Amino acid sequence: GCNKALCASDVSKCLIQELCQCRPGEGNCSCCKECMLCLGALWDECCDCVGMCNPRNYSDTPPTSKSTVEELHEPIPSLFRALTEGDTQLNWNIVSFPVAEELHMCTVVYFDDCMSIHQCKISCESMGASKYRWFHNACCECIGPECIDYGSKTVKCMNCMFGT
Amino acid sequence: GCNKALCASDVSKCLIQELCQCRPGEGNCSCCKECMLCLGALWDECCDCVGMCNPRNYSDTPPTSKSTVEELHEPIPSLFRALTEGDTQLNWNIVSFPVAEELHMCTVVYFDDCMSIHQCKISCESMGASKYRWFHNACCECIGPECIDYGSKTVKCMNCMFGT
């Protein structure tokens, strides 16, 4: 967790001054701003040592955790409904879930085969979608006009579950 | 707009069959699903010609339009409040706006100097932030525990307005 070699000198220096005596983890941390100032430039790499921030990661972050989201110019909602309601295309997986679940109903389309982001935007754009979310596992999720937000964080598209 | 050389053969072929006779732009487009099937693989590159989708872009998309958003593991809300309320750090620009404006109140921190995404996540993580949004202009926006969503789409951080 704590990087002793980098941080031992400066971190101890604050401790002698008696800063960073308050734990954020339970209750208010009155001293937190003061502790950060004493650390200064080393706060990002040493806040773990004083307990003010989480330890340097014990875990490998899934690629799916990142996603990149853009809102399409000039959405065409009528087109989006027409291709979804009817016998849906096999390459497309269609999910409707209640709107604001991710935080009437929100409908999204999950492309099957994994695709590049630039391809994903074009495919959503041809669909009339208001927005698209691109998972960094490369799963692509077009966002319907109804949906308030960016839609489900889940990588629900078949044939690209990589990262699970 | 329309790519005549790629699309003229197949697009005309649908027209003789009398598909793609319905405009999505105003009113319902009954024929839209049928038109897409006739186009098949060329729908992404030729939906513009039949009017079912927007013309290939006349505009250069700003880098800021893309952003990439991830939700931090183990947010520490008490830490985030402590460093924001008090005399804020100069490197940090702090914006509080009503919650659900982007779609009580949502508070975000806009880093001044432009930074890489990996740096942006670390800086937000040291801050206890629930989430961070990284603009592809490279502006970094930490997201407070209160905020429902990913916070303002605006690239409001000083000293990296590139793309405007």
mmCIF file of all heavy atoms in Angstrom, chain A residues 30 47 70 99 139 145:
data_model
loop_
_atom_site.group_PDB
_atom_site.id
_atom_site.type_symbol
_atom_site.label_atom_id
_atom_site.label_comp_id
_atom_site.label_asym_id
_atom_site.label_seq_id
_atom_site.Cartn_x
_atom_site.Cartn_y
_atom_site.Cartn_z
ATOM 1 N N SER A 30 -11.471 16.631 10.299
ATOM 2 C CA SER A 30 -11.246 18.068 10.421
ATOM 3 C C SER A 30 -9.932 18.479 9.770
ATOM 4 O O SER A 30 -9.852 19.521 9.109
ATOM 5 C CB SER A 30 -11.265 18.472 11.893
ATOM 6 O OG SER A 30 -10.352 17.691 12.643
ATOM 7 N N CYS A 47 -1.018 9.880 0.080
ATOM 8 C CA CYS A 47 -2.195 10.017 0.929
ATOM 9 C C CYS A 47 -2.583 8.689 1.566
ATOM 10 O O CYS A 47 -3.225 8.680 2.622
ATOM 11 C CB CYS A 47 -3.359 10.594 0.121
ATOM 12 S SG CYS A 47 -3.775 9.684 -1.384
ATOM 13 N N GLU A 70 -20.305 9.758 -25.859
ATOM 14 C CA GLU A 70 -20.532 10.986 -26.607
ATOM 15 C C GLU A 70 -22.002 11.044 -26.998
ATOM 16 O O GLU A 70 -22.660 10.008 -27.134
ATOM 17 C CB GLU A 70 -19.642 11.049 -27.862
ATOM 18 C CG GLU A 70 -19.792 12.317 -28.697
ATOM 19 C CD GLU A 70 -18.940 12.285 -29.960
ATOM 20 O OE1 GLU A 70 -18.322 11.234 -30.231
ATOM 21 O OE2 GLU A 70 -18.884 13.306 -30.681
ATOM 22 N N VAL A 99 -36.139 3.596 -16.907
ATOM 23 C CA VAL A 99 -35.274 4.763 -17.043
ATOM 24 C C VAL A 99 -34.876 5.248 -15.657
ATOM 25 O O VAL A 99 -35.725 5.381 -14.767
ATOM 26 C CB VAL A 99 -35.968 5.871 -17.852
ATOM 27 C CG1 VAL A 99 -37.191 6.406 -17.114
ATOM 28 C CG2 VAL A 99 -34.981 6.990 -18.167
ATOM 29 N N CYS A 139 -17.162 -3.331 -26.279
ATOM 30 C CA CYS A 139 -18.596 -3.468 -26.497
ATOM 31 C C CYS A 139 -19.223 -2.101 -26.751
ATOM 32 O O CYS A 139 -18.853 -1.103 -26.127
ATOM 33 C CB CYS A 139 -19.276 -4.130 -25.301
ATOM 34 S SG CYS A 139 -21.052 -4.197 -25.557
ATOM 35 N N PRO A 145 -33.513 7.562 -27.819
ATOM 36 C CA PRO A 145 -33.937 8.935 -27.495
ATOM 37 C C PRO A 145 -34.574 9.065 -26.126
ATOM 38 O O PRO A 145 -34.394 10.088 -25.453
ATOM 39 C CB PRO A 145 -34.934 9.266 -28.615
ATOM 40 C CG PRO A 145 -34.645 8.285 -29.701
ATOM 41 C CD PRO A 145 -34.157 7.051 -29.040
#
